[PDB]
């Protein structure tokens, strides 16, 4: 009984939904700190 109540609450709440992808160029979000990736990984050379 409780499972069927939950199934019907699902089928009322389940519907179609928007599906969006987003591509992050991570070199630009490291560029928000201006210590961006092309030098930021390159200057790291240590065994810290």
């Amino acid at each position: 009984l409780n499972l069927a109540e939950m199934e019907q609450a699902w089928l009322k709440r389940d519907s179609r939904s928007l599906e969006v992808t987003r591509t992050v160029s991570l070199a630009a979000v490291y560029r928000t700190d201006n210590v961006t990736l092309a030098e930021g990984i390159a200057d790291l050379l240590k065994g810290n």
Partner: protein
């Protein structure tokens, strides 16, 4: 109307007893209205 011993010369006043009453109890068919249909909404699944 007695005899010399005081005994009654008449036949005694008879009384036929009452018949036993037949018992009878209330019998009623159950009463009940139908239940109305719930409201509608379009689901997410197709008809099959």
């Amino acid at each position: 109307n007695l005899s010399i011993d005081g005994q009654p010369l008449s036949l005694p006043v008879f009384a036929a007893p009452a018949d036993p009453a037949a018992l009878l109890s209330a019998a009623a068919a159950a009463s009940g209205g139908s239940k109305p249909l719930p409201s509608a909404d379009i689901p997410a699944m197709r008809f099959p």
